[PDB]
């Protein structure tokens, strides 16, 4: 019934600058940047709940819940990754079949917010940090 908002298909989110002080050892985090997935022309009768599934490359086997960083000729960061959190503050895995917190769909424009941040899987080395993940919207 509903259709994902056009423009939300191709979305770019800027995390700003994070100094290496905030990423000391494994488990350290950084500031969070808000973003959302828009939904328009939703019919609640056909589907009443919505969920989002994220699919993306993992930085390492033991940290599948953290994205991987693309190599850059200018020098990308090392042992750092991108972490995605739902509205409940819980980390989301990137296995491709883990639906986030199901949210009740409403008639009209629907917004499902999420958060992104930097997760240090090791010693932090400066450089560019470019990542990308494929998100899937599921209707119930």
């Amino acid at each position: 019934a509903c259709a994902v908002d056009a423009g939300s298909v191709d979305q770019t989110v800027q995390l700003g600058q994070v100094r290496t002080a905030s990423l000391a050892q494994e488990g350290a985090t950084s500031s969070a940047v808000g973003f959302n997935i828009q939904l328009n022309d939703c019919d609640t009768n056909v589907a009443s709940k919505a969920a989002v599934a994220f699919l993306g490359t993992a930085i390492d086997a033991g940290h599948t819940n953290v994205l991987a960083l693309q190599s850059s000729a200018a020098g990308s960061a090392t042992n750092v990754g991108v972490q995605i959190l739902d509205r409940t503050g819980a980390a989301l895995t990137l296995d491709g079949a883990t639906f986030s917190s199901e949210t009740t769909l409403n008639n009209g424009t629907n917004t499902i917010p999420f958060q992104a941040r930097y997760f240090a899987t090791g010693a932090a080395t400066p450089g560019a940090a470019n990542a990308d993940a494929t998100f899937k919207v599921q209707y119930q």
């Binding site: 100094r19 000729a73 200018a74 020098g75 080395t125 400066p126 450089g127």
Partner: protein, 196 residues
Amino acid sequence: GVALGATRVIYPAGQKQEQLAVTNNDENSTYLIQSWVENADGVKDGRFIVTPPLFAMKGKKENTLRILDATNNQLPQDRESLFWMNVKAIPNTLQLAIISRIKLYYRPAKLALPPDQAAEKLRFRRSANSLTLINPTPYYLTVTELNAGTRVLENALVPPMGESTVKLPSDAGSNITYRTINDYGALTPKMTGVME
């Protein structure tokens, strides 16, 4: 303690001002911060102004230093220029005043070679007991990890369009490896030396 936001500051020509952060995370120390800028030789010069030149910080706090240009377009537009930014944090007995020096790269707009590719274009010349680094790139090169076989050499800084000489032991290996530091303060992966 006092801490600088970045290790080196890139100042693009044409931009009015630049920003740099100064942080302190010791909630029980009073710090008088003083700032200034000196030329390549370490002599105080008025070509750059830091605002505020001096102020006071108490508790866990950070301030924003603003760097203003005053060269008034009296510098070349074909090569980068070097300056030294100095930040001092003033707290019988001896008092320890900590002064930190960081690099300031004044970078013109028009440039043929992007900064990333400058590292791979460095050239070497092996003399009898010294090594000379020919750098026809328009960027300052901060060469470290200058390893010569089983003998490691001293780090060096080569200005653009120039050559710098470093000592060379006779037992140093034939192959030479070096690394370059980018604008973010990270070591470029090891690269071999292209002898001419």
